[PDB]
Amino acid sequence: MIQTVVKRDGRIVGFNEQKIMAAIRKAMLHTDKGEDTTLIEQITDHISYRGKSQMSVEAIQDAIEMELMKSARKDVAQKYIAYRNQRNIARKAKTRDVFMSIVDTPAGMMMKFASETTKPFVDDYLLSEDVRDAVMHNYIHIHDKDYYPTKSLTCVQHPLDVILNHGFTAGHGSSRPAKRIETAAVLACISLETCQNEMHGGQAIPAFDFYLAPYVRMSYQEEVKNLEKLTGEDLSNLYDAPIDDYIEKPLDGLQGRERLEQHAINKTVNRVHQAMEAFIHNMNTIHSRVFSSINYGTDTSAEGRCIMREILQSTYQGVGNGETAIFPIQIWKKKRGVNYLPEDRNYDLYKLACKVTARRFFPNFLNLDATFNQNEKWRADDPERYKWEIATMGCRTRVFEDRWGEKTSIARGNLSFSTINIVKLAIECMGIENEKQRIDMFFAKLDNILDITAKQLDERFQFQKTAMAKQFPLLMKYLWVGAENLKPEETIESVINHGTLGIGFIGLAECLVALIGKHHGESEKAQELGLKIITYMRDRANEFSEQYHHNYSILATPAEGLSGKFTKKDRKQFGVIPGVTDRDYYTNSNHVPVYYKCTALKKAQIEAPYHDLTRGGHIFYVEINPSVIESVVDMMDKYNMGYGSVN
Amino acid sequence: DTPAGMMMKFASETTKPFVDDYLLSEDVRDAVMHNYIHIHDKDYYPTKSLTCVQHPLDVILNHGFTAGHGSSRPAKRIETAAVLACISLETCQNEMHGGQAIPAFDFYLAPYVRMSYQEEVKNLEKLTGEDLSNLYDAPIDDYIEKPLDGLQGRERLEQHAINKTVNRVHQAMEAFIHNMNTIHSRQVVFSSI
Amino acid sequence: EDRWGEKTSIARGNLSFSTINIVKLAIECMGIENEKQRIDMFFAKLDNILDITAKQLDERFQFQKTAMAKQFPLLMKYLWVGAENLKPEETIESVINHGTLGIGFI
Amino acid sequence: EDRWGEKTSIARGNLSFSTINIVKLAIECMGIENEKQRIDMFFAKLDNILDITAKQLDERFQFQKTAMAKQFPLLMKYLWVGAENLKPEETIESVINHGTLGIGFI
Ligand SMILES: Nc1ncnc2c1ncn2[C@H]1C[C@H](O)[C@@H](COP(=O)(O)OP(=O)(O)OP(=O)(O)O)O1
Ligand SMILES: Nc1ncnc2c1ncn2[C@H]1C[C@H](O)[C@@H](COP(=O)(O)OP(=O)(O)OP(=O)(O)O)O1
Ligand SMILES: Nc1ncnc2c1ncn2[C@H]1C[C@H](O)[C@@H](COP(=O)(O)OP(=O)(O)OP(=O)(O)O)O1
Ligand SMILES: Nc1ncnc2c1ncn2[C@H]1C[C@H](O)[C@@H](COP(=O)(O)OP(=O)(O)OP(=O)(O)O)O1
Ligand SMILES: [Mg+2]
Ligand SMILES: [Mg+2]
């Protein structure tokens, strides 16, 4: 018969026939009709005989189920199997993640639960038939689909002046306008964190130096007032006294009323340094607990320069014990006539920026001299000229133009963006040996996929309106264009049509190899064909914008949540192809593949003429001494490069 | 109506049936269904979380903390200790499902009022060149602020430092309250002191 | 209080708690007409419900162990009682017992 | 070692210990012709004997507590770990779990 049973943990025990009987009985006492031991005895006798003298618990339960689903009582088997499976799932939850398979920080687990429970229901009940079929067959990717039922937007550029000047009331929390540098930075961090919860993208602050400039003078005035209180003097003429720069100088060797004109500047510099050092640590820890971007560089004043040189020296020492800071993402705004040439006003700040980018990976560089960035309403004497300087985010997104409004990049943002796979569009028509027919079929299918993605974006726009203003407290009261005439229970459809709808692509080297012998980085004809298809998409986007009364733009997708979710589903359907579906990850939107070795000059020369057709966003990533960064910035200046992120 | 609220509702509704059907016993489920017992925070059952903790602030103030990729040096004033306390209270809320409390607020924040008193004195020494080495550990009965209507020598150079220390602790005690109240927009963290 | 520690309210908290419905038991014990047998039946039901509640709390405690210290970064490195002698991959069994279990009523 | 205390060896000792006869279990498993079956039977009997021994040690532990500290003046006033916090009439339950239980073999 059977002598020994091995438990699950590993213990060895003697065979006990009164254990199978009591287990079958508890499955017979949960059905419509129970039974006495008439069949239990037969099952146990059959199991005990025909054994191996040593059996496991699972090896006995398998036999129990096999016997139960074989003798006239198939209703006890289906109660036995389900209970066994539930107990197995319960025991597998002590060291694994079974609950995610059925459908580490607790907040992350809850967010994953929400995303997984939301995605399929949106995929089924909200999308139309044609768009659903297009999405199913690995054609188009709808970014942040989990947040679809929450009629949410992507990002916005914060007009920090409103908050800093009038105060903000969000819920039961109200805050007055600031009066020094130790509160303006905190209020900026509060605004970023608050608006992050209301949108599924990043947060950016344009004109970082301009907004905080007025709060460097206030600290100086407070220090002067406190300095004249213990001496009984009268320093009323120093309040509006112009200052060349807030440079710290040693105090020894002076006396009188010119010695205390420097103590105030010294302590003002110290306070501004501490404030800018707290900003970085806060925006790093909050993310490590939020996509944050700050752009600055086009201010010429003693206060803006002080802020720009304190931030650029607190980002040099790093965080903690010298560690580099991942956030916030810092961007330098370079213009011809402000801080570029050696004789311009802020050349030393530019030199410091180039030095810091060689140790701490930041800042980036945004070129204001490009054709698509220049604005005609700019004059370097208006104190509010920052409204006409373009700003970008760390997520590679641009919103400058507008067909029914001003050409500004403040208080505007993205509404939605979707990505179109074109490598499959090339493999699906790789069979043809004649080039002309192959290209014609490629274009014919590209037209249809573009129409489908435009219809999907229009439908998502139609769903995103009908959202009450109260659902977004901070965004639709202080941080959007017309968000000052909207009642709490009023639809935002009267101001929603000021954002950007993005159409992106992933992979162009692969498409050309699946089309012609090589990619754009080796063959000129492939480069011409790629430029042609990009221009065709841009013209179709213009037609869509004219037809649907919206704004459409072409984007180079950042490839942060779509790096791999396009090539596995093509390997499983088309097989391994040399140089196309044999690398793991597709190459980026229009870059140069990381394996085709090139120099910076050739890469820049080939990749430059795409930025004029990628108005929705583009990057110039170069892998690698301040001289190297200076050369990179000069190379960007020589061409129409819009955004660069050399490290 | 806020997106975070909708996501949390989805997550809780997803979690509850799994807890009912896979993790509870048969006698517990019958009592739960027949309106006998109520299990608090059942939506957080799969996340093996705790409810409450009393924060020891001296550990994170004398030394620093390294959570994730961030780091922080030990506090050296009153305008950074009151911020590190907020950071700890907001960071530990996402790892539990209850409330956060700070015991002995006065004891924990006391050793930094004195450090604030020793920097204004240093600035005064740098301005009016003296030594002032005996003012550091002078036993102060109270940090009360009074007007400077008539003083001279080493008696108004010691009241001025007290005035500045009081003005710097007021602006941090109000910042603590404002920061803990404004977590509604950014459920608001349940905090006690 | 602590049966295996010191009377310290620092670095300690609650693990979980459940509440017990008392009024339903009293409504169930309402057809009795002796004023002395009714209270005895109420107590008999209350004892069983308390036993089930304690069993549920113990089972939740057993599940709450086997949790790695690395999914509670700040709590199990600085803020808990013995957190300092723990490693990221170790479970919190050795220090979890300083918390409390709660039985409620309404 | 200590699962609920520090890893010291001062003021700690042994509560009781019991020994298990292994040779008799092997003599009983001697008529089996197959070697692997013999070893499996030996382990099956050893597991049961270990369970009974642990039960006996736990029962003796339960009896050993509820002993007044007055019965061991010096030991429960100065020599034990948690002593000096105990009244003469208080039992030693709170400080008895720092000892060790012993299973032995020959
Ligand atoms: N001692 C045994 N002798 C024979 N078969 C056994 C024995 N123990 C378990 N089995 C087999 C046959 C039973 O139908 C089946 C159910 O096991 P069960 O008695 O619930 O044990 P278990 O390992 O789950 O223990 P527990 O639930 O008490 O921790 O396992
Ligand atoms: N309520 C029930 N309904 C149906 N079948 C049951 C029920 N209770 C027990 N059984 C059956 C299937 C089980 O595998 C067997 C023994 O029950 P049980 O000991 O609870 O299961 P188990 O061994 O899978 O659990 P565990 O892993 O928790 O020890 O009897
Ligand atoms: N808002 C904040 N969020 C997170 N960390 C912060 C914040 N503000 C300050 N910190 C950090 C910066 C330091 O690492 C630490 C202590 O600050 P602080 O007292 O200025 O120390 P320190 O030694 O760097 O000062 P200093 O060099 O200016 O004399 O707290
Ligand atoms: N961390 C914070 N979070 C939110 N609001 C804050 C925070 N810190 C300060 N505040 C609020 C408090 C005030 O309402 C507002 C401006 O503070 P502050 O610069 O001290 O000016 P004030 O109006 O209090 O001036 P004064 O104290 O001179 O009268 O910001
Ligand atoms: Mg510092
Ligand atoms: Mg104030």
Residue numbers in the entry:
A (entry chain D): 1 to 103, 120 to 305, 311 to 645, 652 to 674
B (entry chain C): 120 to 305, 309 to 315
C (entry chain C), D (entry chain A): 422 to 527
In the authors' words:
RNRs produce all four deoxyribonucleotides and are the only enzymes providing de novo building blocks for DNA replication and repair in all free-living organisms. Class III RNRs, which only function anaerobically, are dimers of an α subunit (NrdD) with a stable radical close to the active site, and binding sites for allosteric nucleotides. Binding of ATP activates RNR, and binding of dATP inhibits it. Here, we present structural, biochemical, and biophysical studies on the ATP-cone-containing NrdD from the human pathogen Prevotella copri, showing that the binding of dATP causes increased flexibility of the C-terminal glycyl radical-bearing domain, as well as a flap-like loop that binds across the top of the active site in the active form.
To investigate whether substrate had any allosteric effect on the conformations of the ATP-cone, flap, and GRD, we determined separate cryo-EM structures of tetrameric and dimeric PcNrdD, from the same grid, in the presence of 0.5 mM dATP and 0.5 mM CTP, achieving a resolution of 2.6 Å from 1,105,348 particles before post-processing for the tetramer and 2.6 Å from 1,132,695 particles for the dimer. Two dATP molecules are bound to each ATP-cone and one at each of the specificity sites, giving a total of 12 visible dATPs per tetramer. The tetramer reveals an arrangement of two dimers (chains A/B and C/D, respectively) in which the ATP-cones are all well-ordered and one ATP-cone from each pair mediates interactions between the dimers. Interestingly, all contacts between the two dimers of the tetramer are mediated by interactions between one of the ATP-cones in one dimer (B or D) and one of the core domains of the other dimer (C or A, respectively). In both forms, the C-terminal GRD is highly mobile in all monomers such that it cannot be seen in the cryo-EM reconstructions.
